[PDB]
Amino acid sequence: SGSGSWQTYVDDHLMCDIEGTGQHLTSAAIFGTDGTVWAKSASFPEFKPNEIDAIIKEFNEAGQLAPTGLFLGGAKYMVIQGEAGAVIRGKKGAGGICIKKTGQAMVFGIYDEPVAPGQCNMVVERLGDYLLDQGM
Question: CATH classification of 1-136, choosing from 3.30.450.40, 3.30.450.30, 3.90.1210.10, 3.10.310.40?
């Protein structure tokens, strides 16, 4: 028994096997809307505050990141179609990133083949909607 852990949602809802494919996200994390990390998986990249701030900016006003690309841990993802104030998506070859904004949080998923883009989107959006339903 403990008082709870954001790591529980990272391991059990983001890093779990996806729909009986036997495949999972490479890494995942939950951040506060201010850019503080609440929990991140064992392989999540070495992100730096400027990268998170750039992502916060993009949620506040879409179309800022795409001319430059999305940096996280030094790696460059090309920005693809998202949803203003809700979802930011990035591509790097057959991998990518998906970020879902909630009231109080941002949920990150990073994937590589054979995980499809839609599956990252699905995993991160399902957790984000659950947090939204709880007023977070």
Answer: 3.30.450.30
